[PDB]
Amino acid sequence: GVEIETISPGDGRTFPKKGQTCVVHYTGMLQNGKKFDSSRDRNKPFKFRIGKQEVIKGFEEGAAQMSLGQRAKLTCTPDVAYGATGHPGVIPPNATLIFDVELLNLE
């Protein structure tokens, strides 16, 4: 259940495909909670490829549904990322996550 609310500007045509490594200025937010992760702090903007199940399922399906320059707003369900387990100390079990995602990439 990946729900998209895109802040408009970008190109809307450069869609992510397989074998493509892309760059995201993501920002983690817990729903009704504080931050937990920010690529903008470390300023190394998280180069990663598509398809090898590196990222969670909610971020992976939200990645391909974007384009270059766009700014989305993810809402990840618990069953796709951690909701049975929860990442220990950082993500509680049965959690719903909020992501500010901007795709500024190559390939």
Curated annotation (Swiss-Prot):
UniProt-annotated location(s): Cytoplasm; Sarcoplasmic reticulum
An annotated GO BP: positive regulation of sequestering of calcium ion
Quaternary structure annotation from Swiss-Prot or TrEMBL: Identified in a complex composed of RYR2, FKBP1B, PKA catalytic subunit, PRKAR2A, AKAP6, and the protein phosphatases PP2A and PP1. Interacts directly with RYR2.
One Gene Ontology molecular-function label: signaling receptor binding
The PPIase FKBP-type domain, residue ranges: 19-107
Stored InterPro entries: FKBP-type_PPIase (IPR050689), PPIase_dom_sf (IPR046357), PPIase_FKBP_dom (IPR001179)
EC number: 5.2.1.8
Regulation: Inhibited by both FK506 and rapamycin.
Primary location: cytoplasm
Pfam families, per the entry: FKBP_C
Gene3D superfamilies recorded: 3.10.50.40
Functional summary from the UniProt entry: Has the potential to contribute to the immunosuppressive and toxic effects of FK506 and rapamycin. PPIases accelerate the folding of proteins. It catalyzes the cis-trans isomerization of proline imidic peptide bonds in oligopeptides.
Name of the molecule in the record: Peptidyl-prolyl cis-trans isomerase FKBP1B
Tissue: Detected in heart muscle (at protein level). Isoform 1 and isoform 2 are ubiquitous with highest levels in brain and thymus.
Entry similarity comment: Belongs to the FKBP-type PPIase family. FKBP1 subfamily.
Record's catalysed reaction(s): [protein]-peptidylproline (omega=180) = [protein]-peptidylproline (omega=0)
Any single Gene Ontology cellular-component annotation: calcium channel complex
Keywords: Cytoplasm, Isomerase, Rotamase, Sarcoplasmic reticulum
Organism: Homo sapiens
